[model samples]
Target: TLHNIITDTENVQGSFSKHEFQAETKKLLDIVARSLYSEKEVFIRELISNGSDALEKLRHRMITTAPMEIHLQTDSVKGTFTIQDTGVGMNKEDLVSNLGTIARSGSKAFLDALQNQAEASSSIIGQFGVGFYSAFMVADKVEVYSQSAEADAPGYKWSSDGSGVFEVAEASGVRQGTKIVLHLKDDCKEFSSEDRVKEVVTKYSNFVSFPIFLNGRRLNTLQALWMMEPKDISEWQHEEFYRYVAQAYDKPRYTLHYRADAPLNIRSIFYVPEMKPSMFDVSRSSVALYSRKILIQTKATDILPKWLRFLRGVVDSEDIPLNLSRELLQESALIRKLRDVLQQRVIRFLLDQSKKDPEKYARFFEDYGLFMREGIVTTGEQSVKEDIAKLLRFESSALPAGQQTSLMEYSSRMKAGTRNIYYLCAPNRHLAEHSPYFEAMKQKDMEVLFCFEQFDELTLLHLREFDRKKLISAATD
Candidate 1:
């Protein structure tokens, strides 16, 4: 078969010769199959991700509404695992150059042209070409049959034994997509089980843009709701998505569906749970980070300030570099900028929500106010501290009982030539209203902010001033 395929090639003519991979290529293959991925099951994720990119590429170039789907077939009895996709399948040259050559990624090569097109390029997933070789971790032999989406593109079959050499041959009657069959090794036969395959798909690729089927059963039932337009999404969808991301039964108290193209391509949905978070709950944020809908981290802490740890949601960005590992984001300046941008956006969103419904935001401030206080104490940037301060609420002497006001609003309404913002911290409205500090402020007709929480005083002390108005403690003064 190799002889016939080689002779059929224009370069070979009547002669038959086998191509060999370089020494470095063979050694690199071992590293990829054995250690490149953190876990063995990631091979399933890698292959499915590749299929997704293939389909995305085709969708960008073609106008047809043909079904784009990935089908997974597992045979426990035969120890075979197969994945097929309706995507831009590879030709013989592509198969040899992309699959045969180590670390030559077709997606990365296509990404340059895809970048020229802008929006369509944001979703291409694969970064390293070595992801395909991850199959060797469990497969004794791998076979791929693909036919390019281009008109009249010939079909090809490529087979590799994971021992440095692979063969490609002309194939016929192949469909307009790529299908990979894996002969699972004896110890790795578990991958051939339907339940195992489904588990892996659900874990890593649940939000894949394309539909996935396993043994005729639909997987990936939930869509990436964050990717949709905020106006198009319904209340019920946010409820469901919140429950899934937060892993809680209660509905979200506040839902901020934020999307932005500038200052970083960001598509994120943040939820504050209705229930007051316990100490354990406040330990970390469950905001999953994704690049093109593939799970990069289940609990991404670096993207938001620690004060936002009570939030649970998803943040997807196409700006993340494909070559950067998820664990290495700590030092990436790009991630730092993303963090700063997201913090400002969330703070701004909270401020807007407060304006939309002061009473409801007051309730939120009652439950999560400690977080905002912590934000003021911990943040070093005076501007960011002030931004977080705008989310703070207080009972003002000028307002009736239970009515609240923000520092910004208080500043807006301050008496003419008033240089100091006076505040009184007490256990309750009765104590604050009756305190000697209140009497002096009332005698002078200066407005006083009533602070009831324990940390409220400390937070204001740290804040010191807002909009250049000095925050003075009436009792201490």
Candidate 2:
């Protein structure tokens, strides 16, 4: 009892009355540990995320850096799970103010108070205050030892049992970053196994900016390529990243490196594979959603339209509500806007490719063109339908046989005041050329886009128009 009292007030400068959480705070903590997060295994991810924020904070504070690594050690015998990071360590003041308060994120509050520190704020990942409380889900007791990055800032130790009170005292020879040791509860001893921790680390924290090690073995070796500039990334890197993310053996036929700051801060990479998609791939989505390089959703179907499911890659943004979770994404208009923006960008990228290399883009259209047609039919917005239609390719009467042209190009060559874009869909080019509709169109100066697939007719039928020009099937006559 005497040792406990001495430790509780040892280096505490202010009144110790507020160190104990009030009834409401205790209830909030319970909700965070039990309800806020969907999975119990998320405790590992939450702890690793907090460590990363501290590292980013230190990097900003000193305008300097280091290895900035996170280390995990689990002992099944001791029923303990320990995590340590070489980051911006906390002082005694930080210990009490950050950990002692429930639903108060030091990272969020730190970013809010300083408007000018935009760069630093962007990298700090703890949006919701309860990420730290997630540790209580599996820990009977928790210990934190830290020393501030400031010159001669003393080291301190904080200990708590998820109860109303916590203790902080002076500590000697503490490390530069924070080290957390969790005394795993009996029912949660599974967390103390190396295999379980490794699985969690690989699943959720694999793309973290810093190195992560488990039992002295490096775990997070995959780089977050979406964070890097497109020009800087190599072909081999893309192949490897593609294999890992898509779980495919083939290479990406098309890669779009898209970055934008307006509308939202987005850094993303999308890959269309060289091989045709299998039923399994077509049945599910693969675009992963991340915030500050930590994965939020593995199959983030809402981030991209269902028609874009053939694409596989990463989307990492500081603007995404990572802590709010994915279910909210379904209802957030902000997310809908993000999806629309992404769809437009992808469409623009494909159009650029078609212009640069017609042959290559034609092959792409041959393999994945159905999705683009699907886009035109399913999307309700007229502008979006026209945007997707731009990616479609068809043989033209104005060009040589087997030569495809887009609606924009077709419109570009049209005689002045021509208000219609004509198309004829048949079994093949031979039948389309021989059709009575083609003979009638031949009598006129206007060109006719010959569609070999029936689905193309449906796509054009739904499109109805492009560039304010009506899309009319020749067969209608």
Candidate 3:
């Protein structure tokens, strides 16, 4: 109970204001709800983010920390849902100005100050303040019960039907923070089910910084291990976290948990599972992108090169610049650098594993050789093209059967004045040795790289040169 709950419950002669939402803003909302967002479940994500931002505002302005969390309650019989948070609440005037107007984040001034340092502004996720309006897409009637934390501040209720106007009045017995009750539309009744609500909470809010509970049970139990110290993370923790996010049953063959302060403030965790992959595994994107602890993209494919889709984990950065709306990320030089950085790290991780054991790497190469091939064949950047080229492997004519060597190792043994790195495309060793193309290279007596895959020749066609030696195919006249 509030120490001095407002006892002014008498018939205070006050009327609800009749403020109208603009046409342009409502049009944009309709487009965003019906078109821009492919999935309507994102409304839950936006609301939770708004709740987090409110808490962060209170924490940043005050001298001491207080208990904070988000709670959810669902009812299927009544077709109603509630989301409440223990953060800074709103007063009557604030309720009218914030809930009545659009595009106003409750803490706009604080958000703009740290927009440049996105990484550092992890707390302020709702800059535009319009995230709360997303509730209207699914709700027929939205209600808010908030009590400001300020001294002698009274509790107030804000109600809206999304047509335009809203109702506000003073209320008593309100607790700290805000409580929102959404009367879902008949078409959106699924949101009221406990099962469906739990599923959405697990999918999107599992890693939120604050504790999130649904129906009195904790929903966000998974720890943000990627942001923690790499050395402190345990092996079992890695397996559990990986399986939870990667949606896999097998253990990781290799794990790369990395952190950096400069060069874009990156924190990431990548895993290569030991289980043999079916074609279905590679097509699905597994890496999630997060800003602070809130999920921004479920499949953060843009941060990594396409060839790395096989790996599972996550990448999080506050510094990664996003648009004002926080929906579309701005394509910029920094994003490209992030891609290059993570790609190089994965390539080097594989190279180190290969050197540690020959037979072990051979099995991995056999399973995922196509990705490296795709990288070399598709990438246009010369530097990244060559960096990915290091992972390429081909059978050597000079060495015994089943033996493969990299372009760098093969180039080191090139004879003086030898300017071409020789290769031959064939189905088998038996046929390659007898083909006319190899018969032409027989006179050179140099090591010839044997490519046996379906598209190995196509990959070599794009890789015109490696380590200063022109890549020439014996089949090419």
Candidate 4:
């Protein structure tokens, strides 16, 4: 009876007025339809994410009210798809304010805050609030039906061809929350299939905080472990989190379980796996950054700097504005702060672990020391570069061939007048022990750090000194 009443409501018969697009708006639409973004299919992911957000908001509201539900229906023959949610529905005024305006995102203020912070600009994507326009990428027409949750609230229907203007009018017999109906384009008819839509749902919407359904079947069955406490999380959870985030089958070699409260809240678990460096191949980074358990960027270089590319993990911050886009983040002050804090913490964690177990640390150094050295050269902060340099290990002048020493240990043993730290970048222990660079340090009985990688030269070149002591290559003398 309720369904029939909704279908037969006279209020649904109203039509929206037509409006012409401004010159700039038409040009922008052309860009969006043709050359704006490289990935046209990303519209699907964006729309699905918006749906998930609506469901998530409803779930949060359910903390004080009844639980909300989302249902998805698809029709391959008719080339149509619908996403219905039981949440706070939009009223006529809301439809006019929200849908009538382009790029008016709820997260816009959050993005604006990030813009004011110097560090937040480097990696954030501003909330343009035009995500709904993505529907135009695959649909010929779209319809929205909504009724507010409050009793006696009027229902409304909104329709748009996405040319520019949209129409809105009153409707009756609609359930609370919102429903979206998509009239699929001929080329985009695959979205009407249950399996095709399911794949997209699992890839992008699986971590949504609320339940999802496709053709009345529940989807999104996985838990978002990145939001859970490290201590409360099980080993299996870490394994799953790693597999999903990294898209790798290998288990983590080292895990950095960290959480911070001040200077911005950060909760993260970084993984360093036992794998060969992609130095042989030119592949993009794999690290991703998250905010409030939602993925903001994939392979985010701003969060970890360029040198730490080998790491795979999830960085979650509640303070980060959801509206910030990837392009606007290049100058974000909050990003810089996040970078500095996480970098210092990671370096300290590795150094402390090295002290606790030299053998394990040494093994990791053998595999990943190059990344640390790269940081020493590429990182701008003098203090940070020096700190990372401390994590380096090398053959010592006083110790046996394989034995290594650190800068701190070497400084403690340096003669009173010594003001320079001597290092020799070589191919291996044999070459380092015989190289002319080591000859003078050996003659002076000065301990030398043996560097075996090609990038080692670059590291020393960029870091010229540490702790007020100049760093010199052994052969320089």
RMSD of each: 10.0, 9.8, 12.0, 12.5
Q: Please provide TM-scores, in order, for all candidate models, with all chains considered together.
A: 0.89, 0.89, 0.82, 0.76
Best by lDDT: 1
lDDT pick, better of 1 and 2: 1
Q: Which ranges in model 3 have alpha carbons more than 4 Å from their true place?
A: 1-38, 111-120, 260-265, 281-284, 300-302, 319-326, 329-337, 397-402, 424-445, 450-454, 473-477
Show the colliding residue pairs in model 1. Answer: none
What does the lDDT read for residue 274 in candidate 2? 93
Between candidates 1 and 4, the TM-score winner: 1
Q: Model 1, which residues run further than 4 Å from truth? A: 1-23, 108-116, 150-154, 324-328
**Model with the higher lDDT, candidate 1 or 3:** 1
Q: Candidates' lDDT values, in order?
A: 0.87, 0.85, 0.81, 0.73
Ranking, lDDT, top scorer first: 1, 2, 3, 4
lDDT, candidate 4, residue 243? 80
Query: Which residue pairs clash in candidate 2?
Result: none
Encode model 4's per-residue lDDT on 284-397: one tens digit a residue: 457667665456666675687766778788787766644322222464788888887888888888898789888888988888887888778766889988899889887776
Per-residue CA lDDT of model 2 for 137-175, tens digit only, reads 999999999988888889999999998789999999898
lDDT by residue for model 1 (1-477), tens: 345534554564586777986567777877777756677898888899899989998888875488899999999899999999999999888998988887688875687765465655677777666788889999999999999988788899999899978999899988999999999999899999999998899778989999999998899889999889899989899999899878889999889998998888899999999998888865546798888898877787567888988889999988775442233345578888988898988888899899998888888888898899998999888898898999999999999989998899899988777879999999999999999889989999888999999699999999988998899999965
